[PDB]
Amino acid sequence: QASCENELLKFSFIRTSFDKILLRWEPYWPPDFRDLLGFMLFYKEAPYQNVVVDIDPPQRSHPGWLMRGLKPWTQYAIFVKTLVTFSDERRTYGAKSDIIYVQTDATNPSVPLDPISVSNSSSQIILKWKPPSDPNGNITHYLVYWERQAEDSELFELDYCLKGLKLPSRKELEESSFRKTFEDYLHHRPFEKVVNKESLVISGLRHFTGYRIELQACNQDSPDERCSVAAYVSARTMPEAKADDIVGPVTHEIFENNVVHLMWQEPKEPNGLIVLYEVSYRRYGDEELHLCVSRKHFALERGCRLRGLSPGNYSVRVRATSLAGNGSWTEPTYFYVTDY
């Protein structure tokens, strides 16, 4: 009625995989071979070494079994106990085996979760993340790639002071099951290897540019690196406050027909690009007059044109507008048109 196995079984072949285990053991046969009703294989997940499947009898060498539903990088306690029949004579108690410990191999880890990128300075991106929920091994190091994304080519050929000048200021069970299903579906760029850390500061970056950051976790470095799928994040460094200032005084030229040509140095290194130039002038006592210049306008006229104005002395201030925001107002420059 109870299990009183006295003899011993021994394992002679153990071969693991990332989620399967194949075992063999020495054959057993009681004095009456009909008494064997099969084998019983016990296995459980045993993280510490301080510690049911029914198998048909083999035909009348070494029997074996194969477990398939095992997690990777886990330790299992396994032992095999025979199943005999209480005969009409002195019972053949059968044999069982000692508890052995088998560890499954490792596989590609899971994607690192919760990546957060914050641009505290104008050239550094602080990136933080949490370790993946399914390491599938000892996570040796994280791999971070970062790539500079160029500005949209459409924004380079758009007149902005035209109408349309809105510049971009650059039931829980259902949702839980949705996200569970989508995570269960998952079974030379400048880079960095983060070792024993969950955060990294990116230094040496262009001011106010878009950066695409790809993050991976890896558990094997030298022998044919194998690791997870990437998690993608995006970031944009903060802009320099004075990088949009227009340098040099606004050069002016006057033609004989009261035609005024305005030259001003381009902001060689702006925050991304310069969308428009605003020229504001107002003479002594008049009301302020503003004028827009688009990129194409500035390229075509090498500056700006002014014509058909009343005699007087005007002061010109020019401000450049970029993606980050409005630049600094240029110091006023005074000019006097010829009044014949």
Binding site: R15, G64, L66
Partner: peptide, 18 residues
């Protein structure tokens, strides 16, 4: 692979399918 080895051993000792 492990699966093919298991299939071969099932051919040998248990005889199922094969």
């Amino acid at each position: 692979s492990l699966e093919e080895e298991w299939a071969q051993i099932e051919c040998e000792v248990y005889g199922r399918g094969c």
